[PDB]
């Protein structure tokens, strides 16, 4: 169905006269396609997916120019924020920015994003109408006023509804063999005694794409959170994802428990029961 293009930027100051580190990564859905890192050798925007490598030198030259200009903006911003929060030059501080767009099944614009954080907390973000801002505090209110006066939201909106959507569609087309796939989870259950009266059941979902997935345990058909453990969804390293959920159960009562899996790749939710 739907799809997204997202760019993620991090800038970190270094004490005294050290230059800040700048990292930029871009994703289509859950697939990384470009990166820039100011510490890296190339000093250029680099491909991270096979399908973007078909873009010619004009693309890579333009993106490298732009990502360098992005890094210069964040460099200035680290300075501005140090003053706004009355902070010394001795410590390291972090700015993060995310922006992008979602499209629906018909590949038309669904929504746009532009969010900014300082030192790990929300600073300012574009609201969903793409015309107004939410500011976390007094410093961000200053930025809101400046961005209002300069009509920044209107400029972003043009990017998010126009350029972002068009290029996302181009990427979806050019990378069709790998971006337009869903990989349904391969599932199984494992069992381990944890004493002579309890056992662990672990329900596994492997090799899935995209990353969004829900695993839930039921006992006699009733939702069960007591004595369960769920890990964060994690990358396998080959473009797919992994997740597990586990429950500790009385020995001999394993069959009362079911694990339920929902994923865009499954035409129906799966139900698993300890089958050995």
């Amino acid at each position: 169905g739907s799809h997204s293009m997202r760019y993620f930027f991090t800038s970190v100051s270094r004490p005294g006269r050290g230059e800040p580190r700048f990292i930029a990564v871009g994703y289509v859905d859950d697939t990384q396609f470009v990166r820039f890192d100011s510490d890296a050798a190339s000093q250029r925007m680099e491909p991270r997916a096979p399908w973007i490598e078909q873009e010619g030198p004009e693309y890579w030259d333009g993106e490298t120019r732009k990502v360098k200009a992005h890094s210069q903006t964040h460099r200035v911003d680290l300075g501005t924020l140090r003053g706004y929060y009355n902070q010394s030059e001795a410590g390291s501080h972090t700015v993060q920015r995310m922006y992008g767009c979602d499209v629906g099944s018909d590949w038309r614009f669904l929504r746009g994003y532009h969010q900014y954080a300082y030192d790990g907390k929300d600073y300012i973000a574009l609201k969903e109408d793409l015309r107004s801002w939410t500011a976390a505090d007094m410093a961000a209110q200053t930025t809101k006023h400046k961005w209002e006066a300069a009509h920044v939201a209107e400029q972003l909106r043009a990017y998010l509804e126009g350029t972002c959507v068009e290029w996302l569609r181009r990427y979806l087309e050019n990378g069709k063999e790998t971006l337009q796939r869903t990989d349904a989870p391969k599932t199984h259950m494992t069992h381990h005694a944890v004493s002579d009266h309890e056992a662990t059941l672990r329900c596994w979902a492997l090799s899935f794409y995209p990353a969004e997935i829900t695993l839930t345990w039921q006992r006699d058909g009733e939702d069960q959170t007591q004595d369960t453990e769920l890990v964060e969804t994690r990358p396998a390293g080959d473009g797919t994802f992994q997740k597990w959920a586990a429950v500790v159960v009385p020995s001999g009562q394993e069959q009362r428990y079911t694990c339920h899996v929902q994923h865009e790749g499954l035409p129906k939710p799966l139900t698993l029961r300890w089958e050995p």
Partner: peptide, 9 residues
Amino acid sequence: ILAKFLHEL
């Protein structure tokens, strides 16, 4: 593609 420019805070 990235945004063509960003405004300072």
